[PDB]
Design a binder for this molecule. Structure first.
Ligand code: GLA
Ligand code: GLA
Ligand code: NA
Lengths: 346, 339
């Protein structure tokens, strides 16, 4: 079943229910996921209206770009030239600049394929918007199927050589309550290295570091509390996790990460080289989600993209996009029940 | 009564019906007027869904900007510096460039005041968008009241010195049918001067001309057919009218123009200095409106704004907008039915 209704400010809420009775919802305001429920329980963080996103926090569940993450001094080099982008976090350009794509109303069309339903959102970033060369015709397809797979497929074409590396900003919290920390969740992640941050401004330090056998090593499943309790310098610097993890083996075919709570698991697949993990280190901010005050560590993202900092660490990749060349990316989040035995206490 | 329905592509259609039973409807796709009817008759041109506008012609009824009209070579000077805007008509920047504000989905809020209902649309134009310095936070409020007054009020604020001169692009056609020419309508317009066009590229020619006692003098009501059959080189150049007329007296209190057909009339009020009048000189194009094939001269606009061409004729005005200043504009289309 497919259902649509006004969500506020002119945005719509598109709600899907698959054959297994699992429901998921999206809005065209920032081509974003609003909710995902199983048995009446929220699997992710989200608000009840458009206004809330704009008044409380506009990133949760959104599509962010054109470049996800921080770009030191807002400086990028395009086909030989240096370009300065909108600077919204001090001298840094964070998540494409102020009033970016996550704040726009995208147009959309729904395609019903039976066992699969696709929601294709479109938007044009005009040439020069927030300093980005263009224009860039973008499209984000969110699809949900009978197999409980939520897939995100990105496509883009630019009239001019530019940069492009968007991502999906969903926050998971298997407790279904923002006021409950995700430290009770188990995490498995196929990554042996990470990118440390320079300082509080959160730009990259410049080096790549091996995390095997440290508190950030999740190759073998472990409780999140091990990280949160860590006194490692990087952890203390941001009061939790807020870093890019470099995947060891690439390819859409491999389960790169798995987040588990009791009988529920979320598996992560992607064709991108890294996953930026941010554990909502908001401290006492207490943003209200469904009338619940959010706690420090009350959520966790899995932002799959080319790691930020490629401007300083060329080894991370190249986010350039040549005029006329078609960009594509695919990330998938799949829901499973009883994939493993996870019975713990905190 | 107010009614909201899905207009396609995620866009909304907001319809307002006042005490008199007159119906006017808007869409957030381009903060635009879609229809206006009385007794089942359309007074303006419009389509039946969002896709139509995107496939056929995105200008009808839209809020166009940041700058309305043609800018020679896409060039503007801001604080003594040259800036090149997106060029979408040859080397000119027309109606703000490609994929401009008329094609974006604006957020909106409806305010029901009883005798009056307002629909406030908002959109943020990022700094650099199509070459325009910004951010420019813009709002366009469309309001309809029990006196049959459709009012448009614009407001904007920019973080940087830039340029700003939007307009409303509605096309009227009191015949209620696009296949019929507006040549039978009478027009009155309180303007004695006009701005001639250079040539077919439609950039301004450079001068300001007196229209007194010419085929373009409408100070005294007259049938459009007159102008339409004229031999003035300007009329011939464009095959109708496609020009800025300079208003004689400035101020919102004065009826600047009047469009009439039989018992029905439309009055125009604005706080702007000029009115650009375009008579849908599309030739054989034949765009379809409500299944009706549009004819040459099958519509007419009243684009109120600062005259295009101020980049070459300073006397026309100045469209600059200084950082931090609040821009405001108001235009009103008043419907009257004779008894
Ligand atoms: O709230 C936005 C959030 O987005 C990312 O995860 C960043 O790495 C965090 O530092 C933070 O800016
Ligand atoms: O179709 C849009 C229309 O906009 C204005 O009326 C112009 O002066 C015309 O030349 C035409 O471009
Ligand atoms: Na809607």
């Amino acid at each position: 079943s497919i259902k649509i209704r006004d969500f506020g400010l002119g945005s719509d809420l598109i709600s899907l229910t698959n054959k297994a009775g699992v429901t998921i919802s999206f809005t065209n305001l920032g081509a974003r996921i609003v909710d995902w429920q199983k048995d009446g329980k929220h699997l992710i963080l989200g608000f009840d209206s458009a206004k809330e996103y704009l008044e409380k926090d506009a990133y949760p569940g959104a599509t962010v770009g054109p470049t996800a993450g921080r770009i030191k001094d807002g400086l990028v080099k395009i086909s030989g030239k240096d370009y300065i982008l909108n600077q919204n976090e001090g001298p840094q350009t964070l998540h494409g600049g102020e009033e970016s794509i996550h704040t726009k109303l995208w147009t959309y069309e729904v395609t019903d394929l039976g066992a699969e339903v696709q929601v294709k959102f479109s938007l044009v970033s005009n040439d020069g918007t927030n300093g980005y060369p263009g224009k860039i015709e973008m499209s984000v397809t969110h699809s949900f199927d009978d197999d409980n797979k939520w897939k995100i497929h990105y496509e883009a074409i630019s009239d001019k050589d530019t940069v492009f590396n968007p991502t999906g900003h969903v926050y998971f919290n298997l407790n279904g309550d923002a006021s409950e920390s995700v430290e009770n969740h188990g995490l498995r992640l196929a990554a042996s290295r990470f990118v440390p941050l320079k300082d509080q401004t959160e730009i990259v330090r410049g080096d790549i570091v091996d995390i095997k056998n440290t508190d950030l090593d999740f190759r073998q499943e472990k409780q999140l509390s091990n990280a949160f309790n860590s006194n490692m310098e990087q952890v203390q610097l941001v009061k939790g996790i807020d870093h890019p993890f470099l995947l060891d083996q690439l390819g859409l075919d491999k389960e790169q990460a798995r987040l588990t709570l009791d009988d529920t698991s979320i598996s992560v697949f992607t064709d991108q080289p890294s996953i930026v993990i941010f554990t909502a280190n908001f401290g006492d901010l207490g943003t209200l989600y469904h009338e619940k005050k959010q706690v420090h560590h009350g959520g966790i993202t899995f932002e799959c993209q080319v790691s930020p900092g490629s401007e300083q660490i060329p080894e991370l990749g190249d986010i350039s996009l040549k005029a006329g060349e078609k960009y594509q990316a695919t990330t998938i989040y799949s829901l499973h029940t009883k994939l493993e035995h996870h019975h713990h206490h905190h």
